[PDB]
């Protein structure tokens, strides 16, 4: 979810690879 992802942010839900 801070836009260092694209896929799943992980812990937040979104994308933060």
């Not at 979810?1 to 690879?17: E, I, K, S, V």
């Amino acid at each position: 979810l801070t836009n260092r992802g694209y896929w799943l942010d992980g812990p937040w839900g979104a994308w933060w690879f």
